[PDB]
Amino acid sequence: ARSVRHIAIPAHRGLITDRNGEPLAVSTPVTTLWANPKELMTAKERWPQLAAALGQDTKLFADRIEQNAEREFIYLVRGLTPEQGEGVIALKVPGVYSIEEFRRFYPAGEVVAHAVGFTDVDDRGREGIELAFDEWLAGVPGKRQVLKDRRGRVIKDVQVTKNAKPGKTLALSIDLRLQYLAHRELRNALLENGAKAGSLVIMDVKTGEILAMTNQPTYNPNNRRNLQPAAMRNRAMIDVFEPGSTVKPFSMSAALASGRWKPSDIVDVYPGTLQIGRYTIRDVSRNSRQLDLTGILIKSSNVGISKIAFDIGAESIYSVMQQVGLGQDTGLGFPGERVGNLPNHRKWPKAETATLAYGYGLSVTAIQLAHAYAALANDGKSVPLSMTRVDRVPDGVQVISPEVASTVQGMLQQVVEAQGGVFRAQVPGYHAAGKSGTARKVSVGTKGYRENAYRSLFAGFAPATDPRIAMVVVIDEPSKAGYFGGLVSAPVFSKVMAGALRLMNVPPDNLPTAT
């Protein structure tokens, strides 16, 4: 019974910070106390003092030790603070030992839970960034030998056979300040609107960095006691949806690149419907007989966009959408991330051509939509997405001509700023641009759509004079104060964009309305 034992030396898991060094996941030093029952059995009159110092009931504590009198090792308590373990060891109770351990702590908790994820009881990454970069972050535990006698009392630390190796630091692209702002405002809007879920993505249009990514519902990764599966989802990355009218700027980009359309062109949209075979295209706004190109986007005419689509054909539309990354692998490798679906057909009937152009029959993620709007904002130059801090600006791919992008930027500025436009999306002190959308949710137990359940969207970027930031707001089943994208999601865009631009010290380009 007198032999040497090898015990592990816990390795320090790598620090996860935001883009500026703000800790997001940190391995904190804790103290675990263990006992040698055989030794404690000789110090019985120290039990009541020891039990009390452990916050345990004298008798229940005594039952524990007695039931284990045979054993040489049992945990007393795990994960005390260093000073708490210091106090109990200082009592000098025979057979009580301490070992230094680590506990993974998440300082911003629920604010960044979906992005960062968490580690399991073996601090192996199980969700999110903790999972995706587990190899980078994980340390290598060491090993050492201890000598124990017949009764199991430790008499000597013999040697370290293997040093512990710490994991590596990882800096995310996220700006925690923006993440806090986005988290709070999304939560507020979810609650004001009695919505079921939501996502908000902010992107640096020049660098491809994800500055903020938040979802509702969320959870506290430091306390997962009553955690339900639904709250764990990074919906921005892993859930798909039909983008609806938020793809209209890309259909318009195809129209302009085709050589067949120009901004002054007028389209007749009377009577606000278009019959094609059995299916009917319907406009919601029906207070105009004709619209120029800009007014098609301002009023969000499905009939208008459909007529342009029939003229240019589906292939030109499919092509811009593929080019801006809709339904395409993002290359981020976030666990569970979806590619979505951009349908490719042998032949395109009018029906499928029209619905593609106004954003149904395809499915995207909120990250993809934001990336697509970044391309438009960045003068038609698409840059790869990143969830880690970028050192040097990546090489972009010119996916939309600068000229077309410039015109479409102007139209989207008009969608926000012009009379009859989405005025709730106006950003104090700035010129913003963007597009609202409203989509019926898909039926649960059949094909087709729900009658009274909706997804509210707004996508945009700012400032219009030199776009820095793109943002997408998606809100599921608002039920208390309307459901249109320009009612529900646009105000979120306004407030978050305002705070974001200020936090990033972007100078106001609209002083007639500044703060």
CB closer to ligand 59H, 64 vs 440: 440
The enclosing H or E element of 349 equals none
Q: Which does 438 bind (CB under 5 to 8 A by kind): Cl ion, ligand 59H, none?
A: ligand 59H
165: tokens are 């190796």
Q: Which does 460 bind (CB under 5 to 8 A by kind): Cl ion, ligand 59H, none?
A: none
| DSSP per-residue codes, 225-263 | TT--GGGG--HHHH--B--GGGGHHHHHHHHHHTTS--T
- Minimum separation from the CB atom of position 372 to ligand 59H (A): 15
202: tokens are 């902010």
Q: Which does 450 bind (CB under 5 to 8 A by kind): Cl ion, ligand 59H, none?
A: Cl ion
Residue 335 per-residue DSSP state:
T
What is the rounded CA–CA span in Å between residue 94 and residue 153? 9
Q: Does position 368 bind ligand 59H by CB under 6 A? A: no
CB closer to ligand 59H, 85 vs 437: 437
45: tokens are 């009159």
Of residues 469-488, those binding ligand 59H (CB under 6 A): 484-486
245 is catalytic: yes
Catalytically annotated residue among 27, 199, 245, 288: 245
Q: Which does 452 bind (CB under 5 to 8 A by kind): Cl ion, ligand 59H, none?
A: Cl ion
339 half-sphere exposure, CB direction, 13 A CA radius:
7
Q: Does position 118 bind ligand 59H by CB under 6 A? A: no
Q: Does position 334 bind ligand 59H by CB under 6 A? A: no
- Minimum separation from the CB atom of position 446 to Cl ion (A): 12
Residue type, 391: D
66: tokens are 């007695």
- Minimum separation from the CB atom of position 363 to Cl ion (A): 20
Classify 292 as helix, strand or coil: strand
Closest residue to bound ligand 59H by CB: 245
Q: Is the N-terminal amide bond of 48 cis, ω within 30° of 0?
A: no
Per-residue binder mask for ligand 59H (CB under 6 A), 373-402, x = binder: ------------------------------
Q: Does position 440 bind ligand 59H by CB under 6 A? A: yes
| DSSP per-residue codes, 101-137 | EEEEE-TTGGGSHHHH--B-TT--B-SHHHHHTHHHH
Of residues 253-292, those binding ligand 59H (CB under 6 A): 284-285
What is the rounded CA–CA span in Å between residue 485 and residue 459? 9
Q: Does position 300 bind ligand 59H by CB under 6 A? A: yes
Q: Does position 85 bind ligand 59H by CB under 6 A? A: no
CA atoms 253, 255, 259, 262: torsion sign: negative
What is the rounded CA–CA span in Å between residue 186 and residue 176? 15
- Minimum separation from the CB atom of position 116 to ligand 59H (A): 33
Cα distances (angstroms) measured from residue 8 to each of 136, 138, 141, 163: 21, 15, 7, 10
Task: Give the interface with Cl ion as residue ranges (CB under 5 A).
Answer: 450-453
CB closer to ligand 59H, 133 vs 484: 484
Of residues 38-67, those binding ligand 59H (CB under 6 A): none
Q: Which does 284 bind (CB under 5 to 8 A by kind): ligand 59H, Cl ion, none?
A: ligand 59H
**Residues 115-141 as b or e (16 or more Cβ within 10 Å = b):** bbbbbeeebebbbbbbbbbbeebbbee
Tell which one of 27, 363, 438, 494 touches ligand 59H (CB under 6 A). Answer: 438
Q: Does position 88 bind ligand 59H by CB under 6 A? A: no
- Minimum separation from the CB atom of position 358 to ligand 59H (A): 6
- Minimum separation from the CB atom of position 374 to ligand 59H (A): 20
CB closer to ligand 59H, 259 vs 277: 277
CB closer to ligand 59H, 161 vs 443: 443
- Minimum separation from the CB atom of position 320 to ligand 59H (A): 17
Residue reference for tokens 């006698």: 149
Q: Do residues 93 and 40 lie in contact, with contact meaning Cβ atoms separated by under 8 Å?
A: yes
CB closer to ligand 59H, 440 vs 502: 440
Residues in Cβ contact with 246 at an 8 Å cutoff, skipping those fewer than 6 apart: 359, 369, 435, 436, 437, 457, 458, 459, 472, 485
CB closer to Cl ion, 133 vs 454: 454
- Minimum separation from the CB atom of position 249 to ligand 59H (A): 12
What is the rounded CA–CA span in Å between residue 62 and residue 76? 12
- Minimum separation from the CB atom of position 450 to Cl ion (A): 4
| DSSP H helices in 425-514 | 485-488, 490-503
130: tokens are 């903790």
CA atoms 204, 130, 198, 246: torsion sign: positive
CB closer to Cl ion, 368 vs 438: 438
Tell which one of 12, 396, 449, 509 touches ligand 59H (CB under 6 A). Answer: 449
Q: Does position 244 bind ligand 59H by CB under 6 A? A: yes
CB closer to ligand 59H, 128 vs 421: 421
Q: Which does 486 bind (CB under 5 to 8 A by kind): Cl ion, ligand 59H, none?
A: ligand 59H
480: tokens are 């208390």
Binding residues for ligand 59H (CB under 6 A): 244-245, 284-285, 300, 302, 360, 436-440, 449, 484-486
What positions carry a catalytic annotation? 245
